[PDB]
Amino acid sequence: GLYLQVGAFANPDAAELLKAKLSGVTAAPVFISSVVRNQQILHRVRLGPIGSADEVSRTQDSIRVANLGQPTLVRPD
Ligand SMILES: CO[C@@H]1O[C@H](CO)[C@@H](O[C@@H]2O[C@H](CO)[C@@H](O[C@@H]3O[C@H](CO)[C@@H](O[C@@H]4O[C@H](CO)[C@@H](O)[C@H](O)[C@H]4NC(C)=O)[C@H](O[C@H](C)C(=O)O)[C@H]3NC(C)=O)[C@H](O)[C@H]2NC(C)=O)[C@H](O[C@H](C)C(=O)O)[C@H]1NC(C)=O
Numbered sequence: 001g002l003y004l005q006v007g008a009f010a011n012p013d014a015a016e017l018l019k020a021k022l023s024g025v026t027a028a029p030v031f032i033s034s035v036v037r038n039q040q041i042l043h044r045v046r047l048g049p050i051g052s053a054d055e056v057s058r059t060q061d062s063i064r065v066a067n068l069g070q071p072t073l074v075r076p077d
Pocket of ligand 1: 005006007008009010011012014018042044069070071072
């Protein structure tokens, strides 16, 4: 499965809001992965798993149309 990251935030409310907005533009699962980085909590807003490269492309397009960020492929850890 393929995964996108749409943003990463120190403010968890910003991450939750972006997650909620993304659910309106994609059918793929949207989730927050929070990690410790540089002595702070970083809330990463991600989606997937997406089943194909073509669906990834169209999902990136939909996110840009919605002005929700510049989504990039990531691999989960
Ligand atoms: C190759 O390295 C990887 O590059 C990635 C490049 O995309 C990088 O991901 C990005 O990481 C940056 C931080 O480094 C992250 O930026 C956040 O950007 C948003 C804007 O989209 C900020 O939000 C806005 O802030 C302004 C005021 O500053 C507000 O007025 C505005 O309302 C905010 N917007 C929203 C929607 O709420 C955000 O700052 C707010 C204040 C917050 O933190 O809550 C920035 N955060 C930080 C911590 O700086 C950007 O979103 C993110 N892009 C994507 C697509 O994920 C990778 O770094 C991230 C952190 C990661 O590792 O997961 C790079 N990876 C590594 C390992 O270096």
